[PDB]
Amino acid sequence: KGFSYLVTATTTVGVAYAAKNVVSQFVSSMSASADVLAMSKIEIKLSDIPEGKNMAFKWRGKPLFVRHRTKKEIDQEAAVEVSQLRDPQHDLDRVKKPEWVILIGVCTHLGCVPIANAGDFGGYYCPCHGSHYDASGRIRKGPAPLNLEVPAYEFTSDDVVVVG
Amino acid sequence: REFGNLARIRHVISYSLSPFEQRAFPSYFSKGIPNVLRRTRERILRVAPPFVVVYLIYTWGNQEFEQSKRKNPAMYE
Amino acid sequence: MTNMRKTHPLFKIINHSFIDLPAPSNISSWWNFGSLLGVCLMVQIITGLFLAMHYTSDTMTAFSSVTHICRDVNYGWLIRYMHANGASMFFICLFLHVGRGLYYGSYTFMETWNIGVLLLFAVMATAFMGYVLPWGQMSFWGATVITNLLSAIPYIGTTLVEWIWGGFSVDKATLTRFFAFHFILPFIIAALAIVHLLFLHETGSNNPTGLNSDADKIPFHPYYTIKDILGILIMFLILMTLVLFFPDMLGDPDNYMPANPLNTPPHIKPEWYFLFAYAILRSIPNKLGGVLALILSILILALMPFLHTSKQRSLMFRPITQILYWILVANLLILTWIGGQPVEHPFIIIGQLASISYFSIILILMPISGIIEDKMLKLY
Amino acid sequence: MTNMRKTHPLFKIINHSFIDLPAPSNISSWWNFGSLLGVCLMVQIITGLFLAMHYTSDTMTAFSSVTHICRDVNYGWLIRYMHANGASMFFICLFLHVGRGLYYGSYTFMETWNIGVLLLFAVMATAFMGYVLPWGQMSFWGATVITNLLSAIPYIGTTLVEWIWGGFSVDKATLTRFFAFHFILPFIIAALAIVHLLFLHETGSNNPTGLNSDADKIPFHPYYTIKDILGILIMFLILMTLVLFFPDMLGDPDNYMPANPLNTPPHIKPEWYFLFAYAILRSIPNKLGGVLALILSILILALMPFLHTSKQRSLMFRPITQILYWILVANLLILTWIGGQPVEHPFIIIGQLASISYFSIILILMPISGIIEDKMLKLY
Amino acid sequence: LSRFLGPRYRELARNWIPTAGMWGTVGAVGLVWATDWRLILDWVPYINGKFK
Amino acid sequence: SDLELHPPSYPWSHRGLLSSLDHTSIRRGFQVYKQVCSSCHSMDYVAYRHLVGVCYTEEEAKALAEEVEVQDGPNDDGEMFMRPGKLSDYFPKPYPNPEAARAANNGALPPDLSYIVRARHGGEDYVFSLLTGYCEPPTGVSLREGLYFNPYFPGQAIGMAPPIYTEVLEYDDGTPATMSQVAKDVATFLRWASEPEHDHRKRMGLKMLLMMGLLLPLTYAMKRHKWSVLKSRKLAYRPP
Amino acid sequence: MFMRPGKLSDYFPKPYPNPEAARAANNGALPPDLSYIVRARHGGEDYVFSLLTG
Amino acid sequence: SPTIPSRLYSLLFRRTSTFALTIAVGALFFERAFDQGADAIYEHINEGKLWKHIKHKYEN
Ligand SMILES: CCCCCCCCCCCCCCCCCC(=O)OC[C@H](COP(=O)(O)OCCN)OC(=O)CCCCCCCCCCCCCCCCC
Ligand code: HEC
Ligand code: HEM
Numbered sequence A: 001k002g003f004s005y006l007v008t009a010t011t012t013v014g015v016a017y018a019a020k021n022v023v024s025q026f027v028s029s030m031s032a033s034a035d036v037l038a039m040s041k042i043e044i045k046l047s048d049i050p051e052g053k054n055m056a057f058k059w060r061g062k063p064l065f066v067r068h069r070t071k072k073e074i075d076q077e078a079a080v081e082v083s084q085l086r087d088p089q090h091d092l093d094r095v096k097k098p099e100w101v102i103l104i105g106v107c108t109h110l111g112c113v114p115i116a117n118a119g120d121f122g123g124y125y126c127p128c129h130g131s132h133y134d135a136s137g138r139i140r141k142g143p144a145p146l147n148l149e150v151p152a153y154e155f156t157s158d159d160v161v162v163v164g
Numbered sequence B: 001r002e003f004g005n006l007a008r009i010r011h012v013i014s015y016s017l018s019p020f021e022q023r024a025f026p027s028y029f030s031k032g033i034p035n036v037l038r039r040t041r042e043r044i045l046r047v048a049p050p051f052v053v054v055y056l057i058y059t060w061g062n063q064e065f066e067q068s069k070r071k072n073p074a075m076y077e
Numbered sequence C, D: 001m002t003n004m005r006k007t008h009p010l011f012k013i014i015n016h017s018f019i020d021l022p023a024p025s026n027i028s029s030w031w032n033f034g035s036l037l038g039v040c041l042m043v044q045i046i047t048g049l050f051l052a053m054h055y056t057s058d059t060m061t062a063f064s065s066v067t068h069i070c071r072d073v074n075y076g077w078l079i080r081y082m083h084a085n086g087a088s089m090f091f092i093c094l095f096l097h098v099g100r101g102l103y104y105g106s107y108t109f110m111e112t113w114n115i116g117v118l119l120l121f122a123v124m125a126t127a128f129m130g131y132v133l134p135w136g137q138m139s140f141w142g143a144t145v146i147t148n149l150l151s152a153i154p155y156i157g158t159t160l161v162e163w164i165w166g167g168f169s170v171d172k173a174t175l176t177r178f179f180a181f182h183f184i185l186p187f188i189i190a191a192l193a194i195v196h197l198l199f200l201h202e203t204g205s206n207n208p209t210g211l212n213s214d215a216d217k218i219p220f221h222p223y224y225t226i227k228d229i230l231g232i233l234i235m236f237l238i239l240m241t242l243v244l245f246f247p248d249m250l251g252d253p254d255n256y257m258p259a260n261p262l263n264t265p266p267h268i269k270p271e272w273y274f275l276f277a278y279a280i281l282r283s284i285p286n287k288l289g290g291v292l293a294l295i296l297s298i299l300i301l302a303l304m305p306f307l308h309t310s311k312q313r314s315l316m317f318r319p320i321t322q323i324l325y326w327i328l329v330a331n332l333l334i335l336t337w338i339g340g341q342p343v344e345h346p347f348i349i350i351g352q353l354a355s356i357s358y359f360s361i362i363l364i365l366m367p368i369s370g371i372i373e374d375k376m377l378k379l380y
Numbered sequence E: 001l002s003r004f005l006g007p008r009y010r011e012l013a014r015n016w017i018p019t020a021g022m023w024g025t026v027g028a029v030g031l032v033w034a035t036d037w038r039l040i041l042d043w044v045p046y047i048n049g050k051f052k
Numbered sequence F: 001s002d003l004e005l006h007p008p009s010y011p012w013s014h015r016g017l018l019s020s021l022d023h024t025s026i027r028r029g030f031q032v033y034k035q036v037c038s039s040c041h042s043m044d045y046v047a048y049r050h051l052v053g054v055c056y057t058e059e060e061a062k063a064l065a066e067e068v069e070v071q072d073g074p075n076d077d078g079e080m081f082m083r084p085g086k087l088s089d090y091f092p093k094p095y096p097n098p099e100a101a102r103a104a105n106n107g108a109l110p111p112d113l114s115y116i117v118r119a120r121h122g123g124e125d126y127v128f129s130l131l132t133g134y135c136e137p138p139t140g141v142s143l144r145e146g147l148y149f150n151p152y153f154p155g156q157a158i159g160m161a162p163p164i165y166t167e168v169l170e171y172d173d174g175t176p177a178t179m180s181q182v183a184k185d186v187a188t189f190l191r192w193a194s195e196p197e198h199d200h201r202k203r204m205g206l207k208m209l210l211m212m213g214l215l216l217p218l219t220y221a222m223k224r225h226k227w228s229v230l231k232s233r234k235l236a237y238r239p240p
Numbered sequence G: 001m002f003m004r005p006g007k008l009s010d011y012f013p014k015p016y017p018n019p020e021a022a023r024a025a026n027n028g029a030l031p032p033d034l035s036y037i038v039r040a041r042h043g044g045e046d047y048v049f050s051l052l053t054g
Numbered sequence H: 001s002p003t004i005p006s007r008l009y010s011l012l013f014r015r016t017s018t019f020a021l022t023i024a025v026g027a028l029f030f031e032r033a034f035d036q037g038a039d040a041i042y043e044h045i046n047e048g049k050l051w052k053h054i055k056h057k058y059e060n
């Protein structure tokens, strides 16, 4: 009985390995493709962004706003306290380069994008449920459970910036 | 489970006519409108007041939203 | 010679299921909605088959293909509006179906009720994906919203959303895979409706009185044949007047524009049959809490047979539970209206009160009402 | 305590049809082919579902989408080559199924055989539409050829084929409607295969001896379960070694080019079984005559159960009809090879000799062989 | 309600604890084999090597 | 002439049942295509993201992408502009439309060389025979201008002059670039471009062969074990 | 490319080739396509009439 | 002295839960061992041609 059940066990092990490989292959076919992975790298955003304006592009699939942060807006974000919000967030920690700040328009309630140049905080306004965000990306008044995420970026010489 | 056996019925007599021998709308209005009024009387009080308070709080929510969008003159100085 | 109707195998199956089926004699017009649901399912099959016959599932050509169907194709506009209003009437029939099931104690058929619950899940998924299909602005944005509500799950949500997107956001892969799933899943719905009817035929059918109908049972043909035919004709009256006179009053104007990822809609909302779930998930101010509230608010239907604490089956002789049931129906109407309305005062507090009262009635108040009912009738 | 395997309704149906099903003990490996066909049908359902999740049906993007499946989608080359070589394996198993029925007299099950003929119709139509789906040169030209064959019908064919084309030639409307029909038709195949299994289940299976197998029956479990598992593994071996070592052995090279309405290939060579159909078409030199020749060459299986004039069911004990049957398989192979070959001498004359031999064997020579066999065995 | 609160049901339950627990371990090891968790498979002395 | 010349079966390194492609030859044939074959033939389905990890490394393929220019848009003012290409870009087409291809190639359309091996009978053998079979026409046939004799092309008259010869390009690894070597390299590269899943497919085939050679005896063992009780059953008839 | 007189099968000609050119040549705001704008704006023809006369 | 399959039956195969447990554990270990074996056979039968063989000539 041990010999017969050993034969059965090895057969079941082989069939289980084959089934796992088949289902894993089909699930990998479900997932993102090579072109989608290739388009996740961001090219040069150049310097076509105007002063105080925000440009919307496709970063990591999602809409991303790269906005030229004014000196007055940066001063207002610095004057706004980090401990006065729901989560600990500072302007210098959020943005490495204060001249241009790049964020992703993905809200933390329904995954919406905010309306550019709107709201009661001088930053962005999510219109799905009406949340105001300041220039630092922190939520001030709205149903957003978390702050706006900032995508990881590497900056070369001043005409070259890469995101994602 | 079939018509051969489902229940045990004894001493029960059923009479029926032909559809070609009896009418299709026998006193449809005269004996039908009081039936509808009877059914409405039976089930009017345990059905309507939920929808009545739906209408009440719907109107309240609409006018309160309109009042919230309406500005408040708190600016005189 | 033999009786072919009961000796031929397919014919005797048909005869035992639909011709010589012993049905209760006293079942009202609420019992027609199962046949109406099946006929609406077949209508959706044929009509969407013609839509996919003339439809292209690509983000560059989805909206242009819909315009081509509505304008260039001969009466493909009539086909599209029949499809949309048939989906809406499908949810109308589903809501009245589950209303009959809740009111008349039909959930005691636990297998049939659970099969119906998973059928409701499948129909909701198909309709959501088919609303993703025309690639309108509100279509794409509702797809993003509902998928991020799926992303609310910790440690599994982000990877599973990247898996179901086919990429990094809602794109061509998402649209094409939603097209395939929306085409195919109504056939799984049809197979599960076959299982639904099989379980129902095993357990018999219920009557409005909630009693044993075996004393007075009549064949399905010709009685319920002509009753269901009249129901189908009234259903076609409502569906065709919605198609040919008011094609857009149950629709969405923002779906008639191409999907712009840069431009967000000013007021987003799903379709009218998702509004109560959307309102309750708005009401609970938590991501995981909200999505769990949605899932359990559809799963309380499966939880219904374990909440029956009454010695009477149907609500025909239980007036207090009828009052609670109509308050519940009123509460779903309030939830639909609040899900339609935006997030402003006092819609937040109305939505929270509506969701709290809805769960309290369906889980707490109704069994206590049944126990009070039994005590008032002096059953113990 | 009761047995759920006969008490639960879905479980009692599964028990009565697949678990405690009384089956003849002596059936050979030729009886695994029905299960192989069902398994291959499910494999094609899942595989083409994934293909439609990654595939768009539009003329300027169909070939690009197929290439995107092959290159950018992970394991999409494996999925598409599995689909194509599994269609080849499906038709191999279908032909061996039909040959099993013809050799062992299973066509005496009239309803089961007729439903099988309907299944063959649906499978051939589905596979033709799938072959035209990738929008290759040979795909488009074979579609035009088959639709012109449909246009050979007098007084209806021209309007009927402008109707099927959705215009005046094979174009975007034809490709989209063929995508819809190809996606949807295997579900009708699955439902009609359920009807096929029901009609078989009404009378039980057939043994290779052709005798009454009720004296010696075994349950379907676990004997035919493990035998069917072994057959599934062998069929997976052949299919997967085809996909992973010879993915174009049964394919066509001209299908790997974009479809050109102007340029035409020097040869129109569809897949093997359509090569058979093309040769039985090309046999006689008239349009309507060739169309009727193809139609009768497929309906001749439905005409087969009326041609059984022998007193013995199977060909196990009939040696002359064994020779006639293997000559029939021989000129099946010959006609397939002629369909592969171009139109010159001696391919023409071999074509009509093979066609006349095939038709004369099925109509005339087989019942005469049965009569001669009976009169040798003192049965006539 | 009170059907599963008694000595017979308690000793049936504690007889079935080792079998149900072993089945739970089977489900856990099969699920981590199917899904390839880093958090578990990086600690076994062999399977962690192929992740690198 | 309707008669055609069947290409011979060359013994490729990837001809074997479990033998993959030579990626050094794939690389060499790639710069053969780039410096010779890219000026006429398009490549609509092979990209630098497919080039990485097969024949070039990521940085080399990236720089090789930026050495060519790619049109992109729309601009801020709403026009097109030329930018350096990247790994996500496909290979640049030489002509915008096939009409321009026929205009530049006197009425002949050069096909896309991304499925030419899977599209032509014989495959890489046909490509090698076509590229190495250029010869003067026999006495009896005269070919007009723009047409060249080739016994392997059907119809025997091709719209190509011989594209390759001795030292037609300079290999980076110092391999002598003879005509046969160049043709073999570009045929291997075209086989890779037609079927990029070749090595993974053959590795999976080896895995499948080993696993099913392990499983079929075992599954037959269980089948014969469960079927043993029937196959050793003995029958007896004992009438009164 | 070339120019030709329009046939019946031609659609209405777009005044701008891409929406970016429309925004640049019409001071940022993009004029939407008036093919589904009555069906896409709440009010419909009432909204169009009120917007034009208001 | 119990034999090897005797000890396997006495320890693992008699209980169905332990049978499934050793099936899953053997599935893990056989999965990795067969992966190593098949890969080693593949690069030995195709040594000097793959990108992992010619990779070091251009990586550094
Ligand atoms: C008459 C032969 C006598 C042989 C005696 C041998 C010794 C017998 C005693 C010892 C036992 C040895 C082993 C016995 C094995 C089984 C018995 C056997 O083989 O019998 C002979 C066999 C069947 O005999 P039976 O059918 O009765 O013959 C009647 C005449 N037709 O018949 C045969 O094998 C003959 C088969 C001939 C088939 C020729 C077919 C030619 C045409 C094929 C065309 C195919 C299609 C081509 C394309 C057409 C269109 C272009
Ligand atoms: C411009 C002079 C070209 C060069 C450089 C290359 N090719 Fe070509 N190719 C060109 C034309 C104008 C044509 C069509 C000629 C005709 O008579 O149809 C072709 C065709 C081919 C084909 C297809 C042959 C077939 O049977 O379909 C192949 C396989 C081919 N060419 C190969 C090829 C290769 C590998 C090249 C790079 C070394 C190459 N050609 C360069 C134009 C030009
Ligand atoms: C989605 C497609 C569905 C179809 C096609 C369908 C079909 C049917 C049909 C034909 C009937 C018989 C009509 C009758 O007996 O009055 C029926 C009855 C029933 N359905 Fe459904 N149904 C669906 C969904 C549901 C849902 C969502 C539920 C509950 C959550 C459900 C639960 C029931 C119950 C309990 C009955 C029994 C009614 C009685 O016994 O009186 N079904 N269904």
Ligand code: HEM
Binding pocket: C041, C044, C045, C047, C048, C049, C051, C052, C055, C066, C069, C080, C083, C084, C086, C087, C088, C090, C091, C123, C126, C127, C130, C131, C133, C134, C182, C183, C184, C186, C187, C255
């Ligand atoms: C096999 C069955 C079905 C098919 C083939 C199908 C097909 C389609 C197609 C092709 C579209 C996009 C065309 C367009 O919207 O213009 C669509 C849209 C849609 N589908 Fe389906 N459908 C099927 C069943 C269903 C069912 C059962 C439902 C709901 C219960 C449903 C709900 C919808 C909805 C709401 C839309 C949106 C229509 C619009 O917004 O204009 N579909 N369907």
Ligand code: HEM
Binding pocket: D030, D031, D032, D033, D034, D035, D037, D038, D041, D094, D097, D098, D101, D106, D107, D109, D112, D113, D115, D116, D117, D119, D120, D123, D189, D193, D196, D197, D200, D204, D205, D206, D207, D301
């Ligand atoms: C998609 C295609 C098909 C499927 C899935 C299918 C399914 C099946 C299955 C599972 C069996 C039982 C296995 C067996 O008895 O050997 C069977 C038997 C049978 N099939 Fe099919 N079938 C198909 C096509 C056909 C065709 C094309 C024909 C005839 C022209 C046919 C006629 C029969 C007959 C007569 C039997 C009874 C055999 C016997 O009693 O031994 N079927 N079929």
Ligand code: HEM
Binding pocket: D041, D044, D045, D046, D047, D048, D049, D051, D052, D055, D066, D069, D080, D083, D084, D087, D090, D091, D123, D124, D126, D127, D128, D129, D130, D131, D132, D133, D134, D182, D183, D184, D186, D187, D255
């Ligand atoms: C529900 C089941 C099926 C679905 C969803 C489906 C779907 C598809 C799709 C989308 C394609 C085009 C993709 C491509 O060619 O790369 C295709 C191709 C094809 N299909 Fe299907 N199919 C199904 C069943 C079948 C069946 C049952 C057969 C044959 C009996 C079949 C025969 C083919 C063939 C021959 C091709 C051409 C493959 C090639 O050209 O390489 N399909 N199928």
Ligand code: FES
Binding pocket: A107, A108, A109, A110, A111, A112, A126, A127, A128, A129, A130, A131, A142, A143, A144
């Ligand atoms: S999704 Fe942004 S406020 Fe709700």
